[PDB]
Ligand binder design. Structure first.
Ligand SMILES: Nc1ncnc2c1ncn2[C@@H]1O[C@H](COP(=O)(O)OP(=O)(O)O)[C@@H](O)[C@H]1O
Ligand SMILES: [Ca+2]
Ligand SMILES: [Ca+2]
Length: 313
C-alpha cells in the first residue's frame, strides 16, 4: 500500500498543492488495490461520495522494464518461429501499457458509457468528476460487489447479476459501438434498486456498426440444425458437422430454453474434449459466460439475444 505522504505527493503533482480543498473528506487508508495503483474513498466539496484512483509513481518504470524484458526474450524465439506474429504481441502490450499509464483515456471511455447509459433503468455508470494522467475521481458506486454475490448471493441476486452482465455485453455495441472490455467481477456491483453498477473503462472494445448480423444468424441456424445455410454463413463471416456443433455449444445451448442455468459444471463440459474484428468481442462474450457460470445465474438469454443481437430474431 502506497503510504499517505506519497499518495498526497501524487495528488499535489496531478491536482495542485490545494487538492485537499476540493474535498469535504479524504481517507488515507485505501479501500481497494488497482492494477497499477490504489483506490481511496472521499467526499467531494459538494457532498458526493467519490472514488479516487491514484497510480503508483513507480508503475511506468516497472511496466516499461517488463516490456523491454519481454522484447529481448521473444526476439530469441523469432529465429525458431519466423511465422509467429511475436513482434505484434509486444507492439499490442506496448500500446495497452501507454493507455493504462494515462488515466485520461479510461476517464474519456467512462464519460462515453455514462452518456450512453444516462438514466438507464438497468445500469449505473459513475460520473467522472476529475481526470488527470495519474488520478481519476468519479462518483462512489454503493452496492454489493459481484465477487460477494458469486460467493454468498441469493439465487435472485446471482440471477440478476448474470442477466445484467448478459444485457451489458449484448447491448453496448448497438448503443455506443463499443463493449466494456473487462468482464472481471471487481468491475461490477449490485445496487439495491436492481441496477448493475459498472466501473473500470480502461479496456473498452470498439465495434463500429455494432455486431455483424452474421453472429446472431450463425447461432439461430445452428440451433435450427440448418447446416445447409449455416456452413455457408460461417465460411462467409470467417468442418465436421459435430465440430461446428461443439464450438457453438456454449452460445447455442443457452438460447434453446427460455431460462438457462449457467453453472461451473456445464462450463467445464462445454470446455473439455475428446479475425481481430470480432476476436476481442467473442473473448468478452466467453468471459461473460464464465462469470455467469461462477454466479450460478439463471438467465433469460433467449429473450435478451432476441432483442439485442442482430440476426438472432
Ligand atoms: N466508482 C467506484 N465506486 C466504488 N468502488 C470503486 C469505484 N472505482 C473503483 N472502485 C473499487 O476499486 C477497485 C479497483 O478499481 P478499478 O477501476 O477496477 O482498477 P483497475 O485499474 O485495477 O481496473 C474496484 O474493483 C472497486 O473495488
Ligand atoms: Ca478493474
Ligand atoms: Ca482496468
Amino acid at each position: 500500500p502506497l503510504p499517505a505522504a506519497k499518495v498526497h505527493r501524487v495528488l499535489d503533482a496531478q491536482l495542485g498543492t490545494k487538492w485537499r480543498d476540493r474535498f469535504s473528506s479524504f481517507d488515507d487508508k485505501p479501500v481497494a488495490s488497482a492494477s497499477i495503483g490504489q483506490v481511496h474513498k472521499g467526499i467531494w466539496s459538494d457532498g458526493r461520495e467519490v472514488a479516487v484512483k491514484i497510480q503508483y509513481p513507480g508503475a511506468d518504470e516497472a511496466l516499461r522494464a517488463d516490456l523491454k524484458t519481454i522484447q529481448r526474450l521473444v526476439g530469441v524465439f523469432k529465429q525458431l518461429a519466423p511465422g509467429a506474429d511475436i513482434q505484434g504481441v509486444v507492439d499490442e502490450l506496448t500500446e495497452r501499457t501507454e493507455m493504462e499509464l494515462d488515466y485520461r483515456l479510461e476517464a474519456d471511455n467512462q464519460r462515453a458509457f455514462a452518456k450512453a447509459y444516462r438514466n438507464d433503468p438497468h445500469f449505473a455508470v459513475p460520473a467522472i468528476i476529475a481526470s488527470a494522467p495519474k488520478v481519476v475521481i468519479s462518483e462512489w458506486m454503493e452496492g454489493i460487489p459481484m465477487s460477494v454475490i458469486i460467493r454468498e448471493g441469493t439465487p435472485e441476486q446471482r440471477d440478476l447479476m448474470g442477466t445484467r452482465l448478459t444485457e451489458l455485453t449484448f447491448g453496448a455495441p448497438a448503443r455506443l459501438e463499443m463493449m466494456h472490455g473487462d468482464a472481471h467481477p471487481g468491475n461490477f456491483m449490485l445496487l439495491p434498486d436492481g441496477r448493475m453498477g459498472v466501473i473500470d473503462f480502461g479496456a473498452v472494445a470498439p465495434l463500429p456498426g455494432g455486431f455483424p448480423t452474421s453472429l446472431g444468424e450463425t447461432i439461430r441456424l445452428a440451433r435450427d440444425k440448418n447446416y445447409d445455410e449455416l456452413l455457408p454463413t460461417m465460411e462467409r463471416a470467417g468442418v465436421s458437422i459435430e465440430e461446428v456443433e461443439d464450438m457453438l455449444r456454449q452460445y447455442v445451448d443457452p438460447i434453446k430454453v427460455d431460462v438457462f442455468h449457467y453453472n461451473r459444471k456445464w462450463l467445464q463440459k462445454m470446455a473439455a474434449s475428446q479475425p481481430a474484428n470480432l476476436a476481442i468481442p467473442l473473448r468478452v462474450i466467453a468471459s461473460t459466460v464464465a462469470i455467469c457460470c461462477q454466479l450460478d445465474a439463471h438467465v433469460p438469454v433467449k429473450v435478451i439475444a432476441t432483442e439485442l443481437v442482430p440476426g438472432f430474431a
